[PDB]
């Protein structure tokens, strides 16, 4: 007894999310193999989620001057919204994926000349500075600045939000709001320079992606 087998009609193939089931199917032929390159024309790792979406991104550049009074808010911005911009590589991962869940890494670098004096504050505020005390900001995870000792601090805070995932197209409220206020006034004499720079390097940590969208 001989039997000539025929082609199967039903087939469940495709990709992760794009799912197709066909009634008229055929055998997918395959020749060759995925060839590796021994004399590597690229000595670093390829593009991946781990190295692209988590890397320090400059979001704002201001300049702390001498004419600022006490407890003047130097910077007032959204850490999440400034990372949503066309000029970054995190635009490439967040454009097709709507939902977002992430931790916030903060590193702020300033550069004073040592013939000045004064100090700053860098707190991480959830939501808004609605009725929080200026003098009680150290309860927040903060990092201070000094013209005597250091010029680099870092702050690692988790996702503080009323929900779990994030919507980019219509946010209810900003998730984090990085604040920088004048902790001590910047004084100079004669000849000492009356400017010193300020930069905020921010990046995401522990990103999830859910629910792909067709729209931009």
């Amino acid at each position: 007894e001989q039997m000539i087998q025929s082609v199967d009609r039903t087939a469940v193939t495709g990709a992760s999310y794009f799912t197709s089931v066909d009634q008229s199917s055929v055998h997918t032929a395959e020749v060759g193999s995925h060839q590796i390159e021994p004399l590597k024309t690229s000595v670093d790792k390829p593009g991946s989620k781990k190295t692209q979406g988590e890397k320090f991104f400059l979001i704002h550049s201001a300049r702390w001057l001498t004419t600022h009074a006490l407890f003047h808010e130097v910077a007032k911005l959204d850490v999440v919204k400034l990372l949503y911009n066309e000029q970054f590589a995190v635009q490439g991962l967040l454009r097709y994926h709507t939902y977002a869940r992430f931790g916030i890494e903060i590193q702020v670098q300033i550069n004073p000349t040592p013939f000045q004096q004064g100090g700053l504050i860098c707190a991480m505020v959830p939501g808004d500075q609605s009725y929080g005390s200026i003098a009680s900001l150290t309860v927040y995870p903060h990092g201070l600045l000094n013209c005597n000792i250091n010029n680099v601090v870092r702050i690692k805070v988790p996702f503080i939000y009323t929900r779990g995932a994030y919507h980019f197209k219509d946010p209810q409220y900003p998730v984090w709001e990085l604040t920088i206020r004048v902790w001590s006034e910047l004084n100079i004499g004669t000849g000492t320079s009356a400017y010193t720079s300020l930069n905020v390097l921010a990046r995401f940590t522990d990103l999830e992606l859910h629910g792909l969208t067709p729209l931009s």
């Binding site: 469940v12 193939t13 799912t19 089931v21 066909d22």
Partner: protein, 260 residues
Amino acid sequence: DDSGGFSTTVSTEQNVPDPQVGITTMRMDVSGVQAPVGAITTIEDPVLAKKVPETFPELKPGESRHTSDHMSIYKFMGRSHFLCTFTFNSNNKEYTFPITLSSTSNPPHGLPSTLRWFFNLFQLYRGPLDLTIIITGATDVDGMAWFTPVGLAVDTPWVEKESALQIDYKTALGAVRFNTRRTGNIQIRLPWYSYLYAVSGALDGLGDKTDSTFGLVSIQIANYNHSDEYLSFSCYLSVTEQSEFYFPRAPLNSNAMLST
């Protein structure tokens, strides 16, 4: 087979009751590298309609974050809902209302909002109910509540008039006695006094007014009235844990879900 109707194929068990408990919990990947077999199927055959539904490579949503459970009737219809309400006009106007599970009886003379949809989701009903009445209004009014099964002599349904019945017929069936100043509310069971097997909600013809009713709650008042103040009673229902359910029915259309 006891009957002798033979077939070339095998008929399996179709429309399995209660396929899933609605808690979202664990009881890797649901779909993934394994191909979706329930992506394409045939729905005219109920044997191949039993295939597991998937089309995307998935994983578990996770464990739910409320301790209670809100997917069984024992804890969904346990919260009581409206049945009827009525007022008073003169002295000793005994009120009598039945409980009719039909959908033909439009409210207020029938089933209101939640109980109209709930008493047409399932075919047969056999078991007791919970009755919570609320007394609100004038003071120093005497009252009495009692039960009367079907197939007996009783006063006119949904009409407030003088009772033609007496204290011997009302108290021999079973009754309570209270006053509208002490507590003003009664939580009472509604026991299954029926000679038939089970009542059914949705019926038509002459069997709808006979094979649906299972109980009657009726109230007589006294020491009425005092200085001019309203006297309104409320009647709520809720299911008890002693009843069961049978043969899941298609729900009510949008032109029947009406409220009082």
